[PDB]
Design an enzyme around this catalytic site. Structure first.
Site, PDB file in Angstrom:
ATOM      1  N   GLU A  35     -24.847 -28.493  45.379  1.00 36.03           N
ATOM      2  CA  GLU A  35     -25.417 -28.628  46.721  1.00 36.03           C
ATOM      3  C   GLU A  35     -24.346 -28.309  47.768  1.00 36.03           C
ATOM      4  OE1 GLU A  35     -28.483 -29.210  47.826  1.00 36.03           O
ATOM      5  OE2 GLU A  35     -29.534 -29.573  45.967  1.00 36.03           O
ATOM      6  N   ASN A  46     -32.139 -24.220  56.235  1.00 37.18           N
ATOM      7  CA  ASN A  46     -33.296 -23.904  55.412  1.00 37.18           C
ATOM      8  C   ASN A  46     -34.251 -22.996  56.202  1.00 37.18           C
ATOM      9  OD1 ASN A  46     -32.518 -25.634  53.269  1.00 37.18           O
ATOM     10  ND2 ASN A  46     -33.072 -27.369  54.562  1.00 37.18           N
ATOM     11  N   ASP A  48     -37.290 -23.253  56.906  1.00 34.28           N
ATOM     12  CA  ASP A  48     -38.202 -23.955  57.786  1.00 34.28           C
ATOM     13  C   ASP A  48     -37.549 -24.393  59.100  1.00 34.28           C
ATOM     14  OD1 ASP A  48     -36.677 -26.130  56.927  1.00 34.28           O
ATOM     15  OD2 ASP A  48     -38.271 -27.386  56.433  1.00 34.28           O
ATOM     16  N   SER A  50     -35.021 -26.609  59.275  1.00 31.95           N
ATOM     17  CA  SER A  50     -34.239 -27.783  59.020  1.00 31.95           C
ATOM     18  C   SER A  50     -32.808 -27.373  58.565  1.00 31.95           C
ATOM     19  CB  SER A  50     -34.884 -28.614  57.936  1.00 31.95           C
ATOM     20  OG  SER A  50     -34.961 -27.970  56.700  1.00 31.95           O
ATOM     21  N   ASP A  52     -29.471 -28.895  56.016  1.00 37.36           N
ATOM     22  CA  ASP A  52     -29.013 -29.817  55.027  1.00 37.36           C
ATOM     23  C   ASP A  52     -27.563 -30.240  55.394  1.00 37.36           C
ATOM     24  OD1 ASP A  52     -31.289 -29.130  53.382  1.00 37.36           O
ATOM     25  OD2 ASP A  52     -30.112 -27.300  52.763  1.00 37.36           O
ATOM     26  N   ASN A  59     -31.578 -33.461  54.041  1.00 34.48           N
ATOM     27  CA  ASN A  59     -32.317 -32.552  54.866  1.00 34.48           C
ATOM     28  C   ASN A  59     -32.846 -33.249  56.166  1.00 34.48           C
ATOM     29  OD1 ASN A  59     -34.240 -30.679  55.737  1.00 34.48           O
ATOM     30  ND2 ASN A  59     -35.022 -30.221  53.727  1.00 34.48           N
ATOM     31  N   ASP A 101     -38.368 -42.333  45.850  1.00 33.79           N
ATOM     32  CA  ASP A 101     -39.610 -42.042  46.561  1.00 33.79           C
ATOM     33  C   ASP A 101     -40.777 -41.479  45.780  1.00 33.79           C
ATOM     34  OD1 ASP A 101     -39.414 -39.258  46.399  1.00 33.79           O
ATOM     35  OD2 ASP A 101     -38.997 -38.989  48.567  1.00 33.79           O
TER      36      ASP A 101
HETATM   37  C1  LIG Z   1     -33.801 -23.025  49.850  1.00 33.10           C
HETATM   38  C2  LIG Z   1     -33.224 -22.832  48.622  1.00 33.10           C
HETATM   39  C3  LIG Z   1     -32.012 -23.472  48.357  1.00 33.10           C
HETATM   40  C4  LIG Z   1     -31.453 -24.335  49.317  1.00 33.10           C
HETATM   41  C5  LIG Z   1     -30.189 -25.079  49.186  1.00 33.10           C
HETATM   42  C6  LIG Z   1     -29.308 -24.850  48.113  1.00 33.10           C
HETATM   43  C7  LIG Z   1     -28.097 -25.503  48.090  1.00 33.10           C
HETATM   44  C8  LIG Z   1     -27.713 -26.266  49.178  1.00 33.10           C
HETATM   45  C9  LIG Z   1     -28.619 -26.438  50.206  1.00 33.10           C
HETATM   46  N1  LIG Z   1     -29.814 -25.826  50.227  1.00 33.10           N
HETATM   47  N2  LIG Z   1     -32.095 -24.536  50.499  1.00 33.10           N
HETATM   48  C10 LIG Z   1     -33.223 -23.867  50.769  1.00 33.10           C
HETATM   49 CL   LIG Z   2     -21.777 -25.074  51.447  1.00 28.60          CL
HETATM   50  O   LIG Z   3     -32.211 -27.272  50.984  1.00 26.43           O
HETATM   51  V   LIG Z   4     -31.245 -26.045  51.763  1.00 30.07           V
END
Ligand SMILES: c1ccc(-c2ccccn2)nc1
Ligand SMILES: [Cl-]
Ligand SMILES: [O]
Ligand SMILES: [V+3]
Ligand SMILES: [Cl-]
Ligand SMILES: [Cl-]
Ligand SMILES: [Cl-]
Ligand SMILES: [Cl-]
Ligand code: NA
EC number: 3.2.1.17
Length: 129
Positions: A35, A46, A48, A50, A52, A59, A101
């Site tokens: 991650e 992301n 959308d 948002s 992370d 998120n 959840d």
């Molecule tokens: C779509 C697909 C993957 C990811 C993701 C992967 C690693 C870290 C954070 N976000 N986010 C959106």
């Molecule tokens: Cl990163």
């Molecule tokens: O994500």
């Molecule tokens: V992501």
């Protein structure tokens, strides 16, 4: 802060993630590796709109407030920037809510795609825990 693998494992363990909702500690370490690459300051957009945040890439669509994710919730009742701290407490406490959840660790796309179904104990091999 960029955690070392075992450093992170120990912090996650202290915070009670080992076998939390049945997820052994290697799951959490694996998830963080893919991650955030163990970087507390990691941020990623992301599709959308948002973002992370932090070591476990929590998120803004659901879990924290960043003031720029229309229609979103703040279910961990925290500014997203709080999740970027060298202290992982806020991220872990939020993670515990997320994983409890209904959907477990599938919430973490990198966990689902890269950790689930693998030998995740390898991620804590060699760590004094
Ligand atoms: C779509 C697909 C993957 C990811 C993701 C992967 C690693 C870290 C954070 N976000 N986010 C959106
Ligand atoms: Cl990163
Ligand atoms: O994500
Ligand atoms: V992501
Ligand atoms: Cl990404
Ligand atoms: Cl809010
Ligand atoms: Cl917002
Ligand atoms: Cl589960
Ligand atoms: Na939000």
């Amino acid at each position: 802060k960029v955690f070392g693998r075992c450093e992170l494992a120990a912090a996650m363990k202290r915070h009670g993630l080992d076998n939390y909702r049945g997820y052994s500690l290697g799951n959490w370490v694996c998830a963080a590796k893919f991650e955030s690459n163990f970087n507390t300051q990691a941020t990623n957009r992301n599709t959308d709109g948002s973002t992370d945040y932090g070591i476990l890439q929590i998120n803004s669509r659901w879990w924290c407030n960043d003031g720029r994710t229309p229609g979103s919730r703040n279910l961990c009742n925290i500014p997203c920037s709080a999740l970027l701290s060298s202290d992982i407490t806020a991220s872990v406490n939020c993670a515990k809510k997320i994983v409890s959840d209904g959907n477990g660790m599938n919430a973490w796309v990198a966990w689902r795609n890269r950790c689930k179904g693998t030998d995740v104990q390898a991620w804590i091999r060699g760590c004094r825990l």
